C-alpha cells in the first residue's frame, strides 16, 4: 500500500536512519529482527491499560524519605484545586488516594475528572497514595505548593495504533578454518609490513587465534591462505565472533558472527569493510560493517562451504571441605574488578552447585565456564535449569548489570539477568534506562531479551518511551557502529507508542532540526560576541518563530513541560569557544501558575552522551543516598543528545558560575578572593532566614558534589564550570570536558561561607565533613553497583577506548578493601589536600 510506505517514510525521518536500507548488510539479521519484534510489540500494545497509558502517572513504591516526612507537620498535605478561576486548598492525608481526594472535593462543597498538575501534562491518578506520586515528592522537597487543575481525562483514542504490516554442528569434528584472500584499501597514506590476526572470540574472551605471514603494506595484499584454528566446529559456541584485525600497530578491525540468528554455521564468501583505529570498547565488538565503501579498508575471506548446511541444536550428593568452602566464599566476596586466577576459576567450576547457592557468585562462576567446549557449555545450561535460588533472590541491580556487560555473551546467562529486571517498577527503570540501552552494545544478536525488555517497558509507559526514543535516537545519529540495531529497535517502539506520541516526536524532531541550522550559521559568523551576531540570531529566531517553527513542542529533557513561543529578547549566544545558544521559551500551558520562562541551551560541537552518562550516574547516587535518608542536593540538570554533536541542556534558574561571581574583579589577572561568594550569597538573600537557609543548602550540595566527583574521578575542575543558585545550591556543569592536582573543588571561597577561613574549624565546616563521610560511606555500601556502572560507562561512552586501569580508578577511590574508619579517614585526608593548597589550581589555570 502507500499507506505504510508513507508511514515508513514518516518513521525514517523520526529515526534519522532507513531501516529498509539493505545496502550495508550481508545477511538477513536486521530484517529478521524487524519481523521478530512484531509479536512482543503487539502483545504489549494489546495488553496495555489505555486509561493509565494516556495519563502515565509517575509513582514509586519506595517509602517517603525521612526528610520529606519532616515537611508534613500534622499528618497533613495541602492541595490547591483549580477550576476556571476559583481554587480551594483541600486538606489531605499522605495516604489518601486521588480517588479519595476527589470525593473529599465534591463532598466538601459526574465522576469523570482527574487532577492535572498545573502547567504540566502530568496526572495524579490511580490507586496510589498521594505521597507516593513523584510530583508530590518533588513539591515536598522544594517547599512548593501542590497545584492541580480539575479536568477531563485525555481521550485514549489519541494513542491509537495503526494495524501493521541439516547436519548437526555437534557431529563436526573438523577443526574450523577461514581463508584470508586479501585486503584492499583505495589509498594508504598513513605516512611497512602487515598481517591479519584472526581471533575466535566469545564475549571478549579469545578462544582461539591464528595469524598470517607478514607481507609488504601495499594498497592491495593477497595471501591467500587457510588459517586452521585449534578449535573444532562442534565446540564453536553461539555468539562466537570471527574477529579480523589488521596489524602494523592495531589499525583496522571487523567482526563476523560465526553462528547466525538461525543457528546456522556461517558459510562462503565475504568482503568486509573494516573500522579504523583512531589516535577496550563496545565499538570493537560490533557485527556491523563500515558503510563508507569508498574510503575504508576491506578484507576478503572464504568460509569453508559445504553444500549441506550446519545448525547448532537447541539444548534439550557430595560435600565440600571447610577450608575450600572458605576459599570459595572469599572469591565470591571479592569485587567485580578483582581478577580470577586459573585456580579460582577451577574451584568455582568444580564446586559449581555450591557456587549456585550464592547469587553474588554468578558473574564469577559464569566467568569460569570454558565456552570453547561444547560439553562444558552443555553442563552450564544443565546448571542454569536448576535455578531456585536465583529466582527466589531479591533483585540486586548491581549484580544483574554485571551479567549484561562485555564479559557475558551467552544468551542464557544474559536472559536470567533480564528475567530479574522484569520486577523493576517504572521509577527504577527510568533510573537505569540509559545504562540498559547502552548494554545493548554488548549483545551479539540484534534481537535479544534485553532489547525486548526495553521495547516492552517503553511501550507500557509513555515517560519511559519518551526517553527510550531520545536515548536510541542519540546513538543512531552518532554511532555508525550500532545505528542499524538501534534503528530497528527504535522503529519497533515507534510502531506501538500511538498516534499522539508520534505527533509529538515529529514536532520535537522538527524544532530540533530548525535550531541546528540557526546555530551552525552563528558559530561561523563569530570568530574566536558582536552586535551583528545577536542581530543575525534575533533575526533568524524571528524569521523562524513565525515561519515554519511549531506553535508548541514537548521539552525532550522534561516531557511534562511544553515550550511555546520564543522569548526573542531573552535569547543570547553564550561567550564560549563553541558559541552555545541560550534560548528562552513561553510556556504553552495557560494553567501555568507562574510567568517563568523555559530555558534551553542548544550546543553544536561536543558529543553530549558523556554528560548524559555522568548525569545519570549522579541521579543513581541520589537514589542511593535516598535509601540511607540523605539529601545531598545535587542538580543533575537535564541534558539530551538530540542528534549528531547537538543537544539541549536545562537552564537552571537564578544560577551563575563561580567564575562570574569572582570576576566582578578583583584586579584580574590573576586570581582570587575568599569572601565574595558569601557576599553574593548575602546580596541575593533578603531575610537572614533565607540567607542561612542558603548557607545550609550550600553545605549539602558542596558535599554531594565533592563526593560524587571524587568517586567518578572528575572533581579537579576550573570554577568557570561550577555554578551556584541564588538559594545556595552548588553544581558542577559540563562533563564533556573528561600535577598539581586536587581531588575536588573545595576552595577558600567555599570554606568562607562555612566560616573556617582562614584555616581552623567551624560548626558549618564541621557539618560538611560529617555529611561528606556519611555520603561517602553510603556509596560504598553499593560499591559493586557503582563499579559496574562506571566501567560500563567508560566502555560504551568514553573514548578514549579505555584500559583495565582507567576502570580500576573507581575501586581505588571507593577504597575497596578498607573498613568504615580507614575510609572515613581517607576521605578526611582528601578534604585536607584541598585546604592546603587553596587557590593554586584555579590560579594555575590562569597561568594559561
Ligand atoms: C543556567 O543554568 C545552566 C545549566 C546548565 C549549563 C550548562 C551545562 C553543561 C554545559 C553547558 S555549555 O557547553 O553550553 N557551557 C559550557 C561552559 N560555559 C562557560 N565557559 C566558560 C565560562 N563561562 C561559561 C558559562 C557562562 C554562563 C553560564 O550560565 C549562566 C554557564 C557557563 C558556557 C556554556 C552549560 C549552564 C547553565
Swiss-Prot record:
Residues 317-496 form the PIK helical domain. Residues 567-839 form the PI3K/PI4K catalytic domain. Residues 713-721 are annotated as: Catalytic loop. Residues 74-152 form the PI3K-RBD domain. Residues 172-304 form the C2 PI3K-type domain. It is found in: Cytoplasm; Cell membrane. This is Phosphatidylinositol 4,5-bisphosphate 3-kinase catalytic subunit gamma isoform. The gene is PIK3CG. Phosphoinositide-3-kinase (PI3K) that phosphorylates PtdIns(4,5)P2 (Phosphatidylinositol 4,5-bisphosphate) to generate phosphatidylinositol 3,4,5-trisphosphate (PIP3). PIP3 plays a key role by recruiting PH domain-containing proteins to the membrane, including AKT1 and PDPK1, activating signaling cascades involved in cell growth, survival, proliferation, motility and morphology. Links G-protein coupled receptor activation to PIP3 production. Involved in immune, inflammatory and allergic responses. Modulates leukocyte chemotaxis to inflammatory sites and in response to chemoattractant agents. Activated by both the alpha and the beta-gamma G proteins following stimulation of G protein-coupled receptors (GPCRs). Activation by GPCRs is assisted by the regulatory subunits (PIK3R5 or PIK3R6) leading to the translocation from the cytosol to the plasma membrane and to kinase activation. Inhibited by AS-604850 and AS-605240.
